[PDB]
Design a protein around this ligand. Sequence first.
Ligand SMILES: [Mg+2]
Ligand SMILES: [Mg+2]
Ligand SMILES: [Mg+2]
Ligand SMILES: [Mg+2]
Ligand code: NA
Ligand code: NA
Ligand code: NA
Ligand code: NA
Lengths: 1011, 1011
Amino acid sequence: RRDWENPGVTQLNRLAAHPPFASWRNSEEARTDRPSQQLRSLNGEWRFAWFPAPEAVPESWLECDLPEADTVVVPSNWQMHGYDAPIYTNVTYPITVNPPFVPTENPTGCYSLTFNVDESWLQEGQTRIIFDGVNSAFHLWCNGRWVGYGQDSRLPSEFDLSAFLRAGENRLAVMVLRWSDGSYLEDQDMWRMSGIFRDVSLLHKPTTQISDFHVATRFNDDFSRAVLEAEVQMCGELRDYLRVTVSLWQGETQVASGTAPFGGEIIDERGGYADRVTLRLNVENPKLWSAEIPNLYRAVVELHTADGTLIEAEACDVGFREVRIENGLLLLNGKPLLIRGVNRHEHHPLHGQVMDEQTMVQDILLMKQNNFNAVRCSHYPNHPLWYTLCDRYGLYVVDEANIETHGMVPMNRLTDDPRWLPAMSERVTRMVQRDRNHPSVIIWSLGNESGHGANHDALYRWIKSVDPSRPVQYEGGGADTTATDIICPMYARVDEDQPFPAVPKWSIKKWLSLPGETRPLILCEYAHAMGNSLGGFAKYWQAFRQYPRLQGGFVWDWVDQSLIKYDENGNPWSAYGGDFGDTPNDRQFCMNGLVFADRTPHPALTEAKHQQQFFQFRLSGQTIEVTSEYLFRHSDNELLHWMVALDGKPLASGEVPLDVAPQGKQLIELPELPQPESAGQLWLTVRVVQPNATAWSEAGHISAWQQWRLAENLSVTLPAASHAIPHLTTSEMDFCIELGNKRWQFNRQSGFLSQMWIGDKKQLLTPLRDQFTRAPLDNDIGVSEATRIDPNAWVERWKAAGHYQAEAALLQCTADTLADAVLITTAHAWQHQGKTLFISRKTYRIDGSGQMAITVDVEVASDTPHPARIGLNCQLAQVAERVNWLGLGPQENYPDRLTAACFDRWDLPLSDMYTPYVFPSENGLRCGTRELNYGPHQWRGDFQFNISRYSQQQLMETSHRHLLHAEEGTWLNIDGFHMGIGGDDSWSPSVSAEFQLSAGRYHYQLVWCQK
Amino acid sequence: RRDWENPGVTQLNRLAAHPPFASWRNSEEARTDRPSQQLRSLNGEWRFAWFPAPEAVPESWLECDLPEADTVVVPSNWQMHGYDAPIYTNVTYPITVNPPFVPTENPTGCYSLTFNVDESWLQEGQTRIIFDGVNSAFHLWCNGRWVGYGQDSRLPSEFDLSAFLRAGENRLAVMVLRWSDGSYLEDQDMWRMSGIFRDVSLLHKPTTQISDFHVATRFNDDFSRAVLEAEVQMCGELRDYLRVTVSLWQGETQVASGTAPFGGEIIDERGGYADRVTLRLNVENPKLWSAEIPNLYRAVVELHTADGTLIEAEACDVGFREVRIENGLLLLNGKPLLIRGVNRHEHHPLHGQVMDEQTMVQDILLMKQNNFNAVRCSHYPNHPLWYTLCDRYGLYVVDEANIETHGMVPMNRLTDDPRWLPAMSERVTRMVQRDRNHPSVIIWSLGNESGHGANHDALYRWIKSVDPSRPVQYEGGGADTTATDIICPMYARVDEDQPFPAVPKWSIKKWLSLPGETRPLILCEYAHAMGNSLGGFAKYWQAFRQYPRLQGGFVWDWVDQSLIKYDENGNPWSAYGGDFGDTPNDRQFCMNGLVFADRTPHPALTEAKHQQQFFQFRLSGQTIEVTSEYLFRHSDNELLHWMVALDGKPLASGEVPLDVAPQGKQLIELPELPQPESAGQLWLTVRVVQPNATAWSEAGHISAWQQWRLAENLSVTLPAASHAIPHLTTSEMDFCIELGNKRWQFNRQSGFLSQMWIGDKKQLLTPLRDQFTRAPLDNDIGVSEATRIDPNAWVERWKAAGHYQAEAALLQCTADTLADAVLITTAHAWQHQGKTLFISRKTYRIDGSGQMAITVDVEVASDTPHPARIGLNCQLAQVAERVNWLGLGPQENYPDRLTAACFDRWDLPLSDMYTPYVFPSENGLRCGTRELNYGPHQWRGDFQFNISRYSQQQLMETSHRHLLHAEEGTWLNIDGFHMGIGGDDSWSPSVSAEFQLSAGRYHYQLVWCQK
Ligand SMILES: [Mg+2]
Ligand SMILES: [Mg+2]
Ligand SMILES: [Mg+2]
Ligand SMILES: [Mg+2]
Ligand code: NA
Ligand code: NA
Ligand code: NA
Ligand code: NA
């Protein structure tokens, strides 16, 4: 038969889709969501064995536990237990392309479980089982009898067990296949696993019962009145005594109650639905549900007789809300939304694709914590608890059908074929049937990266038809096809057009005004958070902010899909593509997250928090202007703390409770701010504080901040004549500078300061040389593999030009004795194949103060690529536990990424001065640095630096962070200038011209002193 | 497994759908539609065996042919050879409703066929099997081995046989089942049958072959230029040298040619379609296909190599045409159409549901000869040939998904269910894929009577998505749902509303003007033509002519769906519902044609013909104004005949050839028309004649005609004195009048003309008495059974009023002698259960002239139901061969059905005065009769009459027309007045007020005499 190879057989004997039931027996357990006794978890230890093919499975198996069968926990992913490898392929299908045929070698997993039933369940009512998540397909036998078949790994499969079930002991036999024709629709850029990864349960429902029910909430102009309307459907023997009651609860307060009997109104010629009923409850001044204040009534549906006898009950949480596109705009509850969002996969580093309440909530807090308001179920329906939690905590949700044919050719190859309609069809409807009643769900998605076929069109309209409460979006075939209510491109740039043929990506700004165009624009994907990323994220935030029809988007993505591995010794290490021996694999494109798989923030995470703050500020001299981005709430837990400091010295602070309405303004007037008996930079800094604790935030939680330079006083002081003076020892190839205990040596042949002594002690491990390169970022690399070169790749360019192989050439080197200092002169050329790429002209002026002042003058050939950096490097001998600087911090920060960084005096352990990106690259850069203090040293200027125990060479040459070793001393990279990082996408250049080193001439002056 | 009880499984291993194929191996043959050697028909003598169940089938059967097995022909309809009963039920599913289950008792048909297969087919390429029609599901085996499964009775199921064959003797085994879950989607108002009811064929295909192909014809603003775009797909091995050639032929002239290699344009990110190519051919000044003129080209598709080697060819007839809805109007080739449509079921009285070229062509000719230009495919896809004939003969076509759930509750019960989507989807999809290339198909339709559900919505879009050349239509749940391009109601009335809840039927005029509304309006069905029917037809035509957005319709319906049964003597007769035991059955509802099953015309047909005329005529004095309703053709085969006659005596005739352009006029002035010798009514008549023969018309066929009473010279002449006085002889038993050999006997007890002699010859069999009733037509009865009284039925009303039982009471009866004549004066009263319905007052005046003159005065209770009629009747003793009158004719004509009738002297056999409606009723009617002659008798006044050897009693009591025995003598009915027959619908009163006998006072006069 081989159903798993038939697009036309996607299930056999699978019950109908519906919202989550619990068949509660008491209205109160119901109203309270107390656990239902009619709901039984089959989770725990299960019996299990593996076979390379299903053909290989022993018939005994159906009748009796195999011997060699191990015990495992379920849910779980069999790759997680080590039965076979998990594959990390993005686009290219993990199997060969032959629809609709899976391979002969199809890792089949036979799971089994022996359990008991209560004789009570079998006398009356209906008993059925549920599988919430089976990857990818499966057959099912109970008590040696063949139950049925199911396809689609992200939606709930249920079968009626009533007829196989017996008193007490029963046995379940579950035959799981990895590959199935279902697979063709599941081409997701993620680890490819398999198994019983979701919850198995048992539900006992009465013979006569609740088959389904939907809930919808219609309002009035101003939303002062509303109507909740419920459609209840029943199954089983229909009797005139049979009644329904829908009650609406606000805690312990009944808000409304409705009672009726079955019998629909006339729908057509044949009549109406007798097994149906629609109640309409009016609610006065309803509490509106939103991501900002998730007001939530609770609805209880009860099937019962005219006599009061309660047949059974079901329930759900109700959110009063209206979602609508009107006049080119998305409305929430009548106000125009701003999507501060994020894509998220359900992923656990140890657990595989198994999801737990704990993880779930972790994510959510953090999410909420970060100025986030929406999540995108990229790209299959999520674990059911999730909707609820969002509904609960308050996040807007994009529920996506589980469909992605990315690997096809072209993409719409399946989706444009009728033969695949059904299959796809089953994938959209069921989600819908299941997820309907959840307020958090605000928009529907047809899936991902599967072109644009007629199949989309239909399903689009099907939705449209059954659920008009929400908009449909779909990006494929152009982000603007007829199967989307919303212009939802991915990787679309702010200003620049990506005119691909057929599927051009237009600047989002330009995109909205195309002749004919009128829809709202929301990015399904944008700001690829791959490694050292999110550069120019602000450039999006700005646009959004300015463009009304630019209603935001969802960052890609939330958390790194990294896996836990263990070495010989037992230390756990973060794994990725081709680490499990998976091939083909897509290396690290599985790591795009804003946080590490441990829910540990990436430094870009702050940049998002920052640009997604809900308070905006302007400063008019002494006046502060706070503006509200809340659509619905009042600044009722915010207090403004403000402060003024001088180059880090706080000349004043103060706090001011904010009292701003949504979308409103507040005027805060600062008290005259003292003058400064000194030179330097005046800076005023502000922060919003959440004095109290929320269900998501802590008390004293920081919601936003902003900072400006108030004024600056120039240093017109003239040193102080040097008491003592520096001495110069000329040698045949050295230049000695001695003063105090201190002394400098400049090797006359190389042209470089080669050694620094303070006392008897040597300060350098490595001379101090110029630098034009960086250890390549994921961004810089792209899809440049060692086997398939991307010539446009920044790394590629640099490589090919010899940026990384230049030979500096001593052009000049002189010593000179001034009246007050010794004057050192150098000049180098960096060449390659006789091309002079760079020329470096320095000066060192050492004076009696024991101060070394380096002056740097670079020239960059017009015809060569632009260098990642322009700075100096050397390896320190010293190795100190803290780093101290006057500058932009405290987190890592680059030129096209630093709007969140604040200017201050910073203190942290040398350690925190490194960012363990699993795939090593340039990192922990700190910008606009005035002062850097490390051990006995002091650097003074305007530069960006970095300091770790790892040479660039080492980073560049290492693949996994857990392979790095600290080196002797400390690596100190000091840049006069640093190149942008990019982020728009990670498989083509994302660096804005303005962040590129196009000048051709650079100037920089450092100060090298000793404290 | 039981696939038949699963909407999930609708096929297994069935191949893709595609336009018709023959895999020609030589272009000339393809070009010339010559028969392809690679197409093998397996129609013929087969083997058969029937079982009540599948379970009853013997294993043996797959390997060996049973002995009890019979030899039947294929295609065949098993109940035809009478293995089981054919059921005639309308709405009521003919099995218990329990989706998706069908009865255990499910009659199964065993078809086995042994054939030869040439080795050459086996060597190279693919040999597939095609089943054009199999009712209602089936399993497939070849050479013992199970091949596959298929559901849907109206479309082709294709299987690859390449693996199961062997050179020579091969054996097929087909297990066909009456019921499946398919059956739920197939509830049409027709005989429920089963079997291999359509052609079986063998295709042999190259391994590298054309797999599908699409054709499209685009134009310029005036259609002076066009583009042909051919999309071709191929299956098989892709090689650089493969080529495609699309040549266009107009006869033997190669209009255009295009050659290209495979490999389509970039579709998306993944790329394009390597396995396809779209060519584009420019046709200048293209001849345009229309129902008026079917300008066709031939498209030749070649799959060959770079080197000229033909691989295979495919082909199709191409009609350059543009169908579109602009500004609320349907336009064909830039012109708004007028549909003169008819619904068509595929039915043969002998063959059941089996079509043959013969029957097809005959319907079509007939159709065209009758002013029909389009056909709706009621309610599934037709025999593949049908299309080709329409493309060729010139008919517009509505292609219709085989989807009907009429017998569900509500109707949309399945179609609003996601689970059935699939099943439905493939029924729309596949139809589209097959018929896409035919020009005759101008509109798609999603089925019949299935309410309105979301699945309609989806498939609607899909279609639109895939074929935009044509509109979609669907009447379900309202006729103006979101799923329809055209407002397509069924049975909506010209001016009266039918405000059904949920789904009102507005007046077509009104309907169009509803707020919001902008669509065109075509009735999917109007004019129920059930037996003595089609009254009020003009009323639609008038309308369609006045209202731009009223685009015409499709009358219901073509042919009576009766079947021949045989009598003891082996005499054929026509059956209907339950005349086979079918239970249940909807009796005569299966008969609604314009023609009899044998293709013999019902009299209503002429009225359709006439209102559907293409030339419209106006008279102004001596001027004729002709108008062409041809949109595209010139009156290039028509000449107009005109004639003047005096009370049927021709005084002038002529011919004039029509020179009228589309939508143009012609004026025609007539010579003088000599003053008349006598007195009476001058009539002018014009007719259109096609002197030349067509493909569908014979020579000198009449396509149009019209009459106009010009003048009237009233008679002011007095009777030549009586040269004899009648003698009145009284008695107590009766009054006696005598004059010569002639005598009249009036009964004084009864008050009626009991007897008459001329000579010694009695003239009457039954006395001349008033008549107030008719033998209820189908229309009169409705859906009223003798087990389910539908009170509103006219007949029920009549009955309950005892119009059929009223007993006449004699009030007065007197004689009197005038100077010149005798005067008999009467009065009766029909009463019933105490009420006085009618009051009938008369005068008989016999004079020396020997003329007896009846003057009648009727009073009708206001509060009683309007009578079917008001005349007299009597049984003549004479029985004659001809009938001669001067009035409307020569065909049967009723008050609300008489426009196509003509006023003249007519001569016909008695045979022709009876209209043999299978289901007997009042019939025969000829109105506006001024004089009537039968035997030696002459009646003269202004009445409508009827005359046959069948009393209304008999008719009113005989089910089959075949049970009528001619009574002794002639039955005569002379109505002063008759009620209209209605027929807008046949299940409610359709008789318009202007046609109801409402006045309450009726006056009439007759003059009886001898020839
Ligand atoms: Mg399958
Ligand atoms: Mg992908
Ligand atoms: Mg089935
Ligand atoms: Mg019907
Ligand atoms: Na905006
Ligand atoms: Na690296
Ligand atoms: Na019209
Ligand atoms: Na019918």
